[PDB]
């Protein structure tokens, strides 16, 4: 049964570190296996580096190639013995997500699988120590929160950057859309992956910026200049695998050439990309030019920038984004003479924690923005949905139009990830931001005679700048974060549409723990995205401040008939989280450009001026509770 299948998968995931020791007399028998096994076990696996990605791709293909699920388990079991463990988790998760046979199946928790990445060195150590200190079945609980002097204000952001859910999501997203993805081999293609790459990262930056403003900090600045020295960050993460940890980065070092790539080349790829934007075309390998069409342009750019296998030209355009992670990651030892491990930037699970991440991503976002700039703005025609008027919006909470945010304690179970020994469970307690539940009530007047179908789009943007209160829509575009997108039908006359925050399309409703999965539930059975992907729920709104920071609440309704695509896909599957994740094996459900209406330049000085009749702005307050 599916349940049995789930059980088999969980053990593929257990004791990965330990699983090493090949115990294989000869790989030759495993002809399938010949391609992989270059990267050594203990070594850190880089999600960004090309060579690492190549190995990973080779692994996935074997998994995809597996004739049946049983065969899948077998090769996996054997492969896991030799290959580097990180690569293994990566390859398997991709396989589980896509391979039909796996119509059954969650992947074990990333946080749970590698607890060391989620929690600090100290609380790893304490738990391990307590386990040894007194042998006893009794459970061990450790509170990760610590005590220390906070000299850097960046620390304030830690609730966002360090959040477990955020890191997990980032890991999962890359799994759903792998850079290595080869559509020919799989046969299936990931719709608009390049564009999604752009959108997801942009949102992370946008959301990040809202945190800084909530904090009273200015917006992050892009890492435009390669010459400038980076701010330091020390992760305090250990790797349980070997005797090492992610190397910390002290303050003020500029980027240095690696054997693999010169910083020169980084500059060059990015000049090349800029040219191709303006010249309005990119050059394919064939030396043909493909236009940066309005429809296609973002996607093509996304593939080139990341860059994915899909890039029209790798040899010219290179892989700017990925190399950036690699270069930043080994700033400490570009030479690798030190034989020190890379920093957090190397891993999709960890990278969000470093503040540098935002600087780089804003830089890349800028590239996309220049492209967007080339496009013409939106006419009333494009925006408006005639006959529909938005009367008002209200947010209901304990206090209307105010959302309250607080910190909540939570526990993570280490036992699946690290050797438990005698103890039944070792849990680490951490705290994260959370907010009260709320609902939206939108009153819409349907002037038309017949029932209409509308897509409701809701975004949140900060009211205040760093200077004073200034709702300049051009700037707002960067800041706006997507709260929700959903379909509703309106009858003629007045209508009130109520939606609850829980329903939000952006967030993951729930991630099942390896324990829940040990039994067998019925959300349904799809895969790595299952409970994993989606933005985390606690994270839905920015922290705000004790004072109650003012944010613009924007609701827009668009013609659904226009917005939806027609086609024939599946049952109700992982679609909760469509806004950032997309739909399983389906085309992106919205015709509009991701981020619409915000994606293109706004002529108006004030946001209010921008509004059409099917748009509305309600100012609400977010107040944090200490």
Which helix (H) or strand (E) element contains residue 304? Answer: helix 297-306
Other CB atoms closer than 10 Å to residue 346's CB: what's the count? 25
Among 7, 18, 141, 279, binds a copy of itself (CB under 8 A): 7
When asked if residue 141 is in the footprint of a copy of itself (CB under 8 A), the reply is no
Tally of CB atoms within 10 A around 596:
17
* Residue 170 known to bind ligand: yes
Distance CA 271, CA 63 (A): 38
Give the up-direction half-sphere exposure of residue 219: CA atoms within 13 A in the CB hemisphere. Answer: 18
Query: For residues 463-502, which are near a copy of itself according to CB under 8 A?
Result: 471
Q: Is 321 annotated as a binding residue?
A: yes
Shortest distance, position 470 Cβ to a copy of itself, whole Å: 9
Instruction: Give whichever of 285 and 398 is closer to a copy of itself, judged by the CB atom.
Output: 398
Residue 18 in the binding site for a copy of itself (CB under 8 A): no
361 marked as part of a ligand binding site: yes
Count interface residues toward a copy of itself (CB under 8 A). 12
Q: How far apart are CA 35 and CA 181, in angstroms?
A: 17
Tokens at 602, concatenated:
């706004």
3-class SS of residue 347: coil
The count of other CB atoms within 10 Å of the CB of residue 460 is 23
Stretch of 2-10, 88-96, 564-572, 594-602 contacting a copy of itself, by CB under 8 A: 2-10
Nearby residues of 379 by Cβ (< 8 Å), 6 or more positions away = none
Using the rule CB under 8 A, which residue among 561, 606, 619, 625 binds a copy of itself? Answer: 606
Q: Residues with catalytic annotation?
A: 306
CB nearer to a copy of itself: pick between 404 and 405: 404
| Annotated binding residue 625 | no
The CB-of-617 to a copy of itself minimum distance in angstroms stands at 12
Cα(477)–Cα(429) distance, rounded to whole angstroms? Answer: 37
Burial 149-182 (b: 16+ CB within 10 A, else e): eeeeebebbebbbbbbbbbbbbbbbbbbbbbbbe
The answer for residues whose C-beta is within 8 angstroms of residue 312's C-beta and 6 or more apart is 282, 283, 284, 285, 290, 300, 303, 304
Q: Which is nearer to a copy of itself, 3 or 498 (CB)?
A: 3
**Which C-beta is closer to a copy of itself: that of 1 or that of 149?**
1
Helices 85-98, 164-176: inter-axial angle, 10-degree rounding: 70
Q: What is the CA radius of gyration of the chain?
A: 24
CB of 137 to a copy of itself, least distance (A): 6
| Cα–Cα dist 337/62, whole Å | 34
Residue 179 vs 393, nearer CB to a copy of itself? 393
What's the min distance (Å) between Cβ of 392 and a copy of itself?
A: 13
Nearer to a copy of itself, 298 or 404 (CB): 404
Q: Which stretch binds a copy of itself (CB under 8 A): 159-167, 229-237, 397-405, 454-462?
A: 397-405
> Please, which of residues 202-231 interact with a copy of itself by CB under 8 A?
none
Structure tokens at 468: 């004073």
Contact with a copy of itself (CB under 8 A): which of 221, 279, 400, 604?
Answer: 400
Q: Which of 137, 259, 468, 571 binds a copy of itself (CB under 8 A)?
A: 137
Least gap, CB of 151 to a copy of itself (angstroms): 38
Q: How many helices (H) and strands (E) does the chain have?
A: 22, 14
Owner of token pair 């086609």: 567
Is 431 annotated as a binding-site member? no
Minimum distance from residue 12 beta carbon to a copy of itself (Å): 15
State the nearest-atom distance from the C-beta of 625 to a copy of itself, in Å: 14
**DSSP character for 559?**
E
133 near a copy of itself, judged by CB under 8 A: no
DSSP for 437-481 reads --EEEEEEEE-SSS-EEEEEEEEEEESB-SSSB---HHHHHHH-E
User: Does 294 help bind a copy of itself (rule: CB under 8 A)?
Assistant: no
Q: Does 83 bind a copy of itself (CB under 8 A)?
A: no
CB of 496: closest distance to a copy of itself in angstroms?
A: 17
Residue closer to a copy of itself, measured from CB, 403 or 583: 403
Minimum CB–partner distance for residue 474 and a copy of itself (Å): 15
Q: Enumerate the β-bridge partners of residue 185.
A: none
103 contacts a copy of itself (rule: CB under 8 A)? no
Q: Which stretch binds a copy of itself (CB under 8 A): 103-111, 248-256, 393-401, 446-454?
A: 393-401
Q: Is the separation of the CB atoms in 445 and 389 below 8 Å?
A: yes
d(C-alpha 86, C-alpha 83), whole Å: 8
The pattern of x and - marking residues 550 through 589 that bind a copy of itself according to CB under 8 A reads ----------------------------------------
Beta bridge partners of 499: 440
CA 235 to chain centre: 19
Structure tokens given for 186 = 């799989």
Q: Which stretch binds a copy of itself (CB under 8 A): 235-243, 392-400, 451-459, 507-515?
A: 392-400
Q: Which residue has the tokens 């330091």?
A: 232
Whether the Cβ atoms of residue 346 and residue 325 lie closer than 8 Å to each other: yes
Q: Name which of 4 and 466 has its Cβ closer to a copy of itself.
A: 4
Name the one range near a copy of itself by CB under 8 A: 118-126, 277-285, 311-319, 394-402.
394-402
- Which helix (H) or strand (E) segment holds residue 558: the answer is strand 549-559
Q: Which of 466, 608, 619, 625 binds a copy of itself (CB under 8 A)?
A: 608
Closer residue to a copy of itself (CB): 139 or 158 = 139
**Residues that constitute the known binding site for Cu cation:** 170, 174, 201, 321, 325, 361
The binding site comprises 170, 174, 201, 321, 325, 361
Binding site for a copy of itself (CB under 8 A): 1, 3-4, 7, 136-137, 398-400, 471, 606, 608
């Amino acid at each position: 049964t599916v349940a049995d299948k789930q059980a088999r998968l969980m053990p593929l995931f257990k004791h990965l570190t330990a699983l090493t020791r090949e115990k294989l007399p000869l790989d030759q028998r495993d002809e399938r296996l010949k391609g992989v096994g270059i990267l050594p076990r203990g070594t850190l696996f880089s999600c960004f580096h090309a060579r690492h990605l190549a190995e990973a791709t080779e692994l996935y293909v074997a998994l995809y190639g597996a004739k049946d699920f049983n065969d899948f388990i077998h090769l996996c079991e054997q492969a896991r013995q030799i290959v580097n463990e990180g690569m293994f988790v990566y390859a398997v998760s991709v396989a589980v997500l896509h391979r039909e046979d796996c119509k059954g199946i969650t992947v074990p928790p990333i946080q749970e699988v590698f607890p060391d990445r989620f929690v600090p060195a100290e609380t790893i150590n304490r738990a391990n120590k307590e386990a040894s200190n007194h042998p006893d079945q009794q459970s061990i609980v450790v509170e990760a929160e610590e005590t220390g002097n906070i000299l850097d204000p960046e620390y304030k952001l830690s609730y966002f950057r360090e959040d477990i859910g955020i890191n997990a999501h980032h890991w999962h997203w890359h799994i759903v859309y792998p850079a290595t993805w080869n559509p020919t081999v799989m046969g299936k293609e990931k719709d608009r992956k390049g564009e999604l790459f752009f959108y997801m990262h942009q949102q992370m930056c946008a959301r990040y910026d809202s945190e800084r403003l909530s904090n009273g900090l200015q917006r992050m600045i892009p890492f435009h200049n390669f010459d400038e020295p980076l701010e330091g960050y020390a992760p305090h993460l250990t790797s349980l695998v070997s005797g090492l940890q992610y190397a910390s980065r002290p303050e003020g070092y500029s980027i240095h050439d690696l054997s693999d790539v010169d910083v020169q080349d980084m500059v060059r790829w990015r000049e090349r990309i800029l040219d191709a934007i303006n010249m309005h075309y990119i050059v394919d390998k064939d030396n043909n030019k493909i236009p940066l069409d309005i429809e296609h342009g973002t996607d093509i750019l996304g593939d080139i920038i990341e860059s994915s296998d899909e890039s029209k030209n790798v040899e010219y355009y290179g892989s700017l984004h990925n190399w950036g992670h690699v270069m930043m990651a080994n700033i400490t030892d570009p030479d690798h003479r030190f034989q020190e491990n890379p920093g957090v930037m190397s891993d999709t699970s960890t990278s969000l924690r470093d503040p540098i991440f935002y600087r780089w991503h804003r830089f890349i976002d800028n590239i996309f923005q220049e492209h967007k700039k080339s496009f013409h703005p939106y006419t009333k025609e494009e925006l408006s949905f005639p006959g529909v008027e938005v009367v008002g919006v209200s947010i209901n909470s304990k206090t209307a139009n105010v959302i309250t945010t607080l910190i909540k304690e939570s526990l993570l179970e280490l036992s699946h990830g690290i050797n438990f020994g005698t103890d039944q469970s070792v849990k680490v307690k951490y705290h994260h931001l959370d907010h009260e539940p709320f609902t939206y009530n939108i009153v819409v007047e349907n002037n038309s005679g017949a029932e209409k179908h509308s897509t409701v789009r809701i975004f949140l943007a900060p009211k205040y700048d760093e200077l004073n209160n200034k709702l300049e829509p051009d700037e707002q575009r960067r800041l706006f974060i997507e709260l929700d997108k959903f379909f509703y039908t309106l009858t003629p006359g007045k209508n009130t549409i109520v939606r609850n925050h829980q329903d939000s399309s952006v967030t993951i409703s729930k991630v099942r723990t390896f324990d829940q999965l040990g039994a067998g539930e019925g959300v349904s059975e799809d895969s790595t995205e299952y409970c994993s992907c989606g933005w985390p729920e606690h994270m839905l709104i920015p922290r705000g401040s004790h004072k109650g920071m003012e944010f613009e609440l924007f609701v827009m309704l668009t013609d659904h008939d226009e917005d939806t695509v027609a086609g024939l896909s599946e049952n109700a599957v992982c679609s909760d989280a469509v806004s950032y994740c997309g739909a399983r094996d389906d085309r992106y459900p919205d015709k509009k450009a991701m981020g619409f209406p915000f994606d293109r330049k706004i002529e108006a000085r004030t946001a209010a001026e921008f509004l059409t009749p099917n748009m509305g702005l309600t100012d609400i307050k977010i107040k944090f509770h200490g």
